[PDB]
Every structure is written in C-alpha cells, then in structure tokens.
Structure 1
C-alpha cells in the first residue's frame, strides 16, 4: 500500500540538505519500497512556521519528517551541546558517526520522543567577514558575529566578538542591514543564500580539530513510523542509523569543496590559523568547555563524562 510522508525543512530547495541529501534519500526509499513510500519535500518552511518549530511539528505529527539544526531550539537537546564545544570536531564523517553512536547510547533521552533517522553534522565551520581578515582573536574585538546556536555564540563571545544568534536564512539580511559584520558557517550552506558574495574574507584553522560544528537532526514522527508496515519499517531502517550518519558526514565533507570554490571565484580570501593565534583560540575554548561542564552538571547531566565520551567517539571514527 502507498504511504505519503510530509517532509519539512527551512533551507531553499537548491541547498545541499534538500537537493543532495533528503531528495536522494527519498528516491532511495521510493526505489526500495517499489514506489510505495512517497516523501513529499516542502523546503523553505513551505508548510508554515519558523525554523525552531520544525522539531515541534515532527514531534506532534504536524509533519512526518524534518531536517533541522538542534540548537535552533536552545536547551531542548542538552546532550548534543557537547559536540558544539570549541575545537571538538574532526571531519564531518568522523564527527557524524560519533554523534549517532552518542545518540544511540548516552544521549538517547534527548530524542526519545522521535524516530531518529540520523544525527550528524557539517564539516567544521569557518569565520566569515565582509572584508577584514581574521588573523587572531583580537581581530574579532567589537565585531558583531552571527552564530547558529547559544553554545556557538558563547564561543564567539569568548573569542572577543559581540555575538548574535539567528537561523541561517536570516544572515544575508542581517549583513546587508548592519546587524552583523560576519558569521560562522561551513562553506556548504553559503551559496544557497549568496553569503559568499556578501562576505569576502574567510578564516579557518589548521591542525586536526576544526573550529566548531553544530548537530543536525533528521527525524521522523514516532507515531507515523510505528504505523508503517513491517516491510516499510525495514526500508526506513535500512536508510537510517549509523550507516546513514556516516554517509551524511561523508556528503557534508564533500559539499565544502564546490562551495569553497564558488567563494574564492567570487573574490574571497581564505586564511588558516596556526601557531600562536591558533593556540590562543584553543585556550579560550578550554574555558567554555569548563563552563559547559558546569552548565551540564547544573542541568543534571555528568558534563565531564559527556565531553570525554564525545572526544573518544570522535577519535574512534577519525580514520
């Protein structure tokens, strides 16, 4: 029997998460169910609401599937904050597998009200400004810098910037209107919003750990999943879990390449921190890590254990 699943997300249709992740995912699900499981894709919040509401919509069955950024709803998924800490991430391939095993084990309570398809992340984000090259933390002093989540905006404050939080569709307008001077994002999301034309100076870090990442949630309504036939359940589950997280991370590592090329072809510079400037950023990061452990403790979680577990899972998959 045929079944229609409503997918909802915030980026426009050409963004990688839609065109190069959810669309081919839905095509595989269609092929492997012999045309029976039909995902209808609604990008750009085309079923109503604002990006932070995607988790409520999928939890309550307003829609059947969403892709979103966990930290767009602050405090709702506290375990996952550990993966947002400064200099936590390796490749998206390694860090996404770590995220999924984390969610399958010690962080499972965060997502108990949902059917998890995968939890994964982008390649470590970069620092973008209109024109000023960021050579060290001091260059961020007085700069109004966007981050995706409260953890990441606190990283930015710890580096000396004036933090501003917002979902990514708001960034281009905030840049054009002077609300922000720059932002952190991975390369891959930028062309969908013309962000590589609005910022020409870009900074990354050298070494084995990137600046930050933020967890993505790819989720299905639990009641809808439970209503599927055993046969349809197996198609979904064959396209879910650790193998999907790994594939997603591999995809997101690759997405950086064409997007970086667009940004440099548009006249951008890319500078990589090392040495003293990098060490200074990492030392600042350690402070936010310590503060996060306290914050996790105060919310009833073993912050120190969670940070160790995250780090050990990232190294486990860093092959």
Structure 2
C-alpha cells in the first residue's frame, strides 16, 4: 500500500512528525498483520504533485495520503472547515470533534466523496515574515501573505492584505523569490521546510494560536472497502492510535520552532489572548459568513462546530 505526502522525508525516529507518523502507522500495521499488509512511503511529493493526491485517492488511484484537508475546498466546499479561525481554539477541543456531531458529519461527507479518515491530525501554526513580525490583524495591511486556505485568506483580505494561494511545500521558493511578504503554516512546517532561511521574523503559537489546520491521514474508500474486514479494522485501530502521537508531536514543535528561529537570528514573538481574539472576531464576520453561505452542508458543519465551542466553555 502506497502512502503519499508533500512533506520532507526522514526516518521513523527523526524528521517531520507527519512523515514519522505514517512510517509508525505502516510499521505497526505490518507488525500486527504479519506481512499481509505492507506499505511504501512517498514523501516530498515523490509519487505525484501535492494537488493530485486527494482526487487520486477518490478515484482509487492512490491508496493513502496525508494532506491538509482544506486544500480540496474548491471541489468540496465543506472541507474548508479544515482551516478556519475561531472554530478551533485548542487541541483538546479540536480533537474532541471526532466523536461529536461535527466529526461524524465531516466523516460522512468524506465517505460520500470516496475518502476514509484514518487519523485525525490538527496543527497549530504561526506566521513567518520577510520583514516585521505579523502579530495583529492590522499588521497584514498592505502585505502579500499566504494564509493557507480560502477562509484564512478571507480574513487576511478583510485586514487589507493581498493573498496568495499555494501548497505549503511551495512556500520556501515563494518567500525566497519575494513572491510574498509572509506565510502562515504549521509549527512543524516552519521547521521542516527550513523557512528560517527565507524569513526575518516568526510569530509562534507558544502562547496560543488562531491558526489550526486539519491535516489527516486518509485512504481511498474504493481500496479500503475491498480489503478483508480484519485488515480494515486494523487500519482503523492503528489509525486512531496515531492521533496521540500527532497531538504530542505538534505541541512539541509549537515549542521547538521558537528556538530554531532564535538560533537562526530571527525575531521571534508570541500571541496574546487579546490578539488571538481579534483574529477570531474578524473570522466570525468574514470567513464564517463566506463558509456558511456556500452551501447547506457548510452551514450544517459550521453549526455543529459551534456546539463544540459552547461545550468547551460550559461543560467539564
């Protein structure tokens, strides 16, 4: 079975946690299945381009991939929820989605489009800038910035930025060549794409973040459904186990990224609660409106996601 992703390749012990994750997944499924299932890992878009992975899975042309979900928001607008500030406020709350109505609905929508959710993965982010740190939304005014998704970019546009769309594996080159002023991506990516080589400032997620992206490990439903039940169950069981690994790895990178950039000479700053709320309040007026209005499926997912915000405040 092939597993494709856009991130740098490494080993089980060392590298981009997403690459490590899928190698641990493969290794554990292999161990448990005793050779019945074997895997081949294709990092760094070595199998196919980043934007071809999702559709290939849907068609059964690609077995598995780990991809930012919202990259597919153009063909399936519902998926734009994968990066949309204000709906996710913490890792605990974001992972809680899985068994709640919002996660059940997201899973249902993906199944209808030919996709199985193997591991939930959420990642906090930040902003790297070729000049001043981008901290407050108003800092984006007049800058050209890659937000990472339609809905992140709708917020940036409101703030007066010009926005640029590209997959994160293309950030390094775009920053290098001055095609943009700043880029948002995950803590892990800031490290693995070596963006300290092409920026002077980093705004981290150490004291919280407004940017959280869903980057799940997924599998073609056409392929998954043809496998024997015992193998299907094993993929799902091991898949769920990977989520604790992703949780711990993303949090560690949220911290470690700061030291990487400091040692490289960058100006490194964090986000206050007040600043984070400013970005989330703009999201409600812009992104949430754009998303909810797109189709009834989006409206439904937005409503269900909002319940998890209330649960986070009012339940224990």
Is the shorter-chain TM-score for this pair beyond 0.5, marking a shared fold? Answer: yes
Q: Secondary structure at the match of 1:165?
A: coil
**Aligned equivalent of 2:285:** 287
Contact 2:83–2:214 (CA under 8 A) maintained in structure 1: yes
**Aligned equivalent of 2:258:** 260
RMSD of aligned alpha carbons = 2.9
**Aligned equivalent of 1:179:** 179
- CA spacing shift, 1:13–1:95, aligned 2, 3 Å: same
User: Please, which of 241, 247, 250 is the counterpart of residue 248 of structure 2?
Assistant: 250
User: Hey, what's the Cα distance between the residues in 2 that align with 1:114 and 1:213?
Assistant: 22
**Aligned equivalent of 2:137:** 137
- CA spacing shift, 1:267–1:44, aligned 2, 3 Å: same
The superposition leaves residues 221-243 of structure 1 with CA deviations (integer Å, 9 ceiling, x where unpaired) of 223222223332232122134x5
Cα offset, 1:12, TM superposition = 2.2
Contact 1:131–1:199 (CA under 8 A) maintained in structure 2: yes
Cα offset, 1:301, TM superposition = 3.4
The alignment status of 1:238 with 2:234, answered yes or no, reads no
The alignment status of 1:71 with 2:70, answered yes or no, reads yes
Cα offset, 1:206, TM superposition = 8.0
TM-score by length of 2: 0.85
**Aligned equivalent of 1:114:** 115
The alignment status of 1:38 with 2:33, answered yes or no, reads no
Q: Secondary structure at the match of 2:192?
A: helix
**Aligned equivalent of 2:4:** 8
Contact 2:102–2:305 (CA under 8 A) maintained in structure 1: no
TM-score by length of 1: 0.85
Q: Secondary structure at the match of 1:7?
A: strand
Q: How does 1:90-105 map to 2 (within 5 A)?
A: 90-99=89-98, 101=100, 104-105=103-104
Cα offset, 1:134, TM superposition = 2.9
- CA spacing shift, 1:258–1:120, aligned 2, 3 Å: same
User: How many correspondences in the alignment?
Assistant: 310
**Aligned equivalent of 1:56:** 55
- CA spacing shift, 1:178–1:204, aligned 2, 3 Å: same
Q: How does 1:210-225 map to 2 (within 5 A)?
A: 210-225=209-224
Gaps spanning 5+ residues in structure 1: where?
A: none
Cα offset, 1:69, TM superposition = 1.0
* 153-162 vs 173-182, which moves further: 153-162
Contact 1:158–1:285 (CA under 8 A) maintained in structure 2: no
The alignment status of 1:86 with 2:85, answered yes or no, reads yes
Q: Secondary structure at the match of 1:233?
A: helix
User: Hey, what's the Cα distance between the residues in 2 that align with 1:240 and 1:180?
Assistant: 36
Cα offset, 1:259, TM superposition = 2.9
Cα offset, 1:300, TM superposition = 6.7
- CA spacing shift, 1:181–1:229, aligned 2, 3 Å: same
Q: Secondary structure at the match of 2:155?
A: helix
* 270-279 vs 34-43, which moves further: 270-279
- CA spacing shift, 1:55–1:146, aligned 2, 3 Å: same
Cα offset, 1:285, TM superposition = 2.5
Contact 2:107–2:116 (CA under 8 A) maintained in structure 1: no
Contact 2:19–2:43 (CA under 8 A) maintained in structure 1: no
The superposition leaves residues 260-304 of structure 1 with CA deviations (integer Å, 9 ceiling, x where unpaired) of 321221112222343765554343223124423542456673365
Contact 1:147–1:156 (CA under 8 A) maintained in structure 2: yes
User: Hey, what's the Cα distance between the residues in 1 that align with 2:274 and 2:66?
Assistant: 38
The superposition leaves residues 159-180 of structure 1 with CA deviations (integer Å, 9 ceiling, x where unpaired) of 3321111101111111121110
User: Hey, what's the Cα distance between the residues in 1 that align with 2:94 and 2:298?
Assistant: 25
Contact 1:188–1:260 (CA under 8 A) maintained in structure 2: no
User: Please, which of 299, 306, 310 is the counterpart of residue 308 of structure 1?
Assistant: 306
